[PDB]
């Protein structure tokens, strides 16, 4: 995954 995609994964799992 890219830098943005690693940051997107974090945001999409934040409750």
């Amino acid at each position, epitope marked *: 995954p890219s830098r943005l995609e690693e940051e*997107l994964r974090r945001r999409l799992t*934040e409750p």
Partner: nanobody, 121 residues
């Protein structure tokens, strides 16, 4: 980056709704290097990200909406859309168009206006 949502409003449980969003004040080449996506917020919750298309064209989803929500990005026309199928009462929220910029040391959030989606029998 200026973002504007179209669509919203009332749907019955199990129903479908499409939101769209256009970006302006940004070139195609600049916006290509950014992510585009969608957040939602119900009263008494924080804004949380539900779907995005990365700068590499990869759609990504929150588990609670995967399969039901489809996010699509038109790079050429600087648009992102959220097709919401099989909607549930707990999908009721204000939905925000969002762009994520990598500013190297930090990330920058660009926000749309928000549009209410209401799921009611």
């Amino acid at each position: 980056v200026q973002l504007q949502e179209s669509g919203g409003g009332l749907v019955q449980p199990g129903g479908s709704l499409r939101l769209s969003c256009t970006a302006s004040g940004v070139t195609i080449s600049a916006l290509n290097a950014m992510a585009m996506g969608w957040y939602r917020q119900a009263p008494g919750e924080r804004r949380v990200m539900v779907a995005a298309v990365s700068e590499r064209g990869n759609a990504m989803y929150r588990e609670s909406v995967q399969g039901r929500f489809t996010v699509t990005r038109d790079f050429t026309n600087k648009m992102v859309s959220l097709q919401m199928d099989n909607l549930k009462p707990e999908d009721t929220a204000v939905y925000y168009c969002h762009v994520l910029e990598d500013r190297v040391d930090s990330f920058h959030d660009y926000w749309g206006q928000g549009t209410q989606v209401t799921v009611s029998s």
